[PDB]
Structures are given as C-alpha cells and as structure tokens.
Amino acid sequence: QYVVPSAKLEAIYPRGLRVSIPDDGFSLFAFHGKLNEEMDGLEAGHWARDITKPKEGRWTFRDRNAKLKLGDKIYFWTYVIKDGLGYRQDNGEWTVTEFVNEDGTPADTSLEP
C-alpha cells in the first residue's frame, strides 16, 4: 500500500494560490484547506476542490481567487484516489508570509511595500 503525497503550496501575487502533489498514478486528488484555522477532522476549511486529472506526474491546484495575506498560516488535508485506494495528507500546514512569482519561484526578498 502506498502513501499520500505532499501538497506543496505557494502564495501567488497579487492574489492566488498554487499547490502541487507528487502524483503516483492516481485518479482523484481532493484538497481541503482552511486559512488561519487548524482542523481535527474533515472540515470544509476553504480550498475545497476535487481534481481527477493530474498535470504531469504531479497534480496542480491553482486558485487565483484566494485573498491571502502575509503572516497568515495554512491548515489542510489532501486526499488521493489510486483506483479505490485513496490516502490523505492531513494535519498539513503552510505559510503566507512569503509569495512566489508568476514565474514559479519565491518573490519575497524582505521588501514589503
């Protein structure tokens, strides 16, 4: 039995959120995440989207409608489906103190406007 991948998030500028998970030939990648609020189960949180088709050996959950702010913390749990064999990466966490570039890399060099 395999294990659930790792959801790598990033703060998009000026308003967005991109996530990624090392796919393993799955079929469904459900993402549940709340902003500034932990979780102890399966709460709707915020980012609640179920993907069925990866991107390229890795799923991508982009959200250009997430009004995030520096300092804020992330809390979520991801769920994959490898043909009736799902696994989730709960108790996950991420930061908002940094933002990445549309290029795909961190665009935070200690320069707060």
From Swiss-Prot:
Q: Where is this region: Binds to curdlan, laminarihexaose and laminarin. The complex formation with laminarin induces self-association of the complexes into a macro structure, likely containing six protein and three laminarin molecules. The macro structures may form a platform on a microbial surface for recruitment of downstream proteases, as a means of amplification of the initial signal of pathogen recognition for the activation of the phenoloxidase cascade?
A: 1-113
The impact of changing H32A is: Reduced binding affinity to laminarin by the N-terminal domain. Loss of binding to laminarin by the N-terminal domain
Q: Post-translational modification, briefly?
A: The N-terminus is blocked.
Q: Region labeled Binds to curdlan, lipopolysaccharide and lipoteichoic acid, activates the phenoloxidase cascade and is resistant to proteolytic degradation by trypsin or chymotrypsin, but is not as effective as the full-length protein in aggregation of microorganisms — which residues?
A: 1-113
What results from changing D40A? No effect in binding to curdlan or laminarin by the N-terminal domain. No effect in stability of the N-terminal domain and laminarin macro structures nor in activation of the phenoloxidase cascade
Region listing for Binds to laminarihexaose and laminarin, in residue ranges: 2-105
Q: What is the effect of changing W77A?
A: Loss of binding to laminarin by the N-terminal domain
* Tissue and organ expression note: Fat body and hemolymph.
Which residues are recorded as binding substrate? D50, W77, T78, Y79, R88
| Chain ranges of the CBM39 domain | 2-101
Q: Where in the cell is it found?
A: Secreted
| Bias type Polar residues, positions | 107-113
**SS bond list:** none
User: Of which family is this protein a member?
Assistant: Belongs to the insect beta-1,3-glucan binding protein family.
Provide the function of this protein: Involved in the recognition of invading microorganisms causing their aggregation. Activates the phenoloxidase cascade. Binds specifically to beta-1,3-glucan. Binds to curdlan, a linear water-insoluble beta-1,3-glucan polysaccharide, and to laminarin, a water-soluble beta-1,3-glucan polysaccharide containing beta-1,6 branches. Also binds to lipopolysaccharide and lipoteichoic acid.
The subunit field of the Swiss-Prot or TrEMBL record says: Monomer.
What's the name of the protein? Answer: Beta-1,3-glucan-binding protein
Please give the organism: Plodia interpunctella (Indianmeal moth)
User: Which span of the parent protein is shown here?
Assistant: 23 to 135 of 488
